[PDB]
Amino acid sequence: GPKPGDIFEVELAKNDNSLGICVTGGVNTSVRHGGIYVKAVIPQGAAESDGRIHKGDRVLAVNGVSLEGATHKQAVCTLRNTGQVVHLLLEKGQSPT
């Protein structure tokens, strides 16, 4: 799989055009790599069931848009204003940085 600090792309179906995942960080605030960290993944959802996502990993860009520096609210707004499948780069947030 992707190594710690390795950038990987994943495609996830937003599932019934609505997702409702959660995040934290963004504005380079307290969280280690300043990124959006996946604060919570709902179970039974696309993110969980597809397994391209887990808590602790961080989102880099959403649909191309460099999301780093974007706020935690803007993070999810950006995940909303996607198409059917969400293309978004993650970086492993396992890395104790």
Ligand SMILES: *CC(=O)Nc1ccc(/N=N/c2ccc(NC(=O)C*)c(S(=O)(=O)O)c2)cc1S(=O)(=O)O
């Ligand atoms: C999921 C969780 O634990 N916390 C959470 C979830 C969602 C939000 N804010 N969502 C949101 C969605 C859309 C927009 N604007 C658009 O036009 C796309 C906004 S904004 O306008 O406020 O940027 C926000 C917040 C939170 S929080 O953890 O309570 O911040």
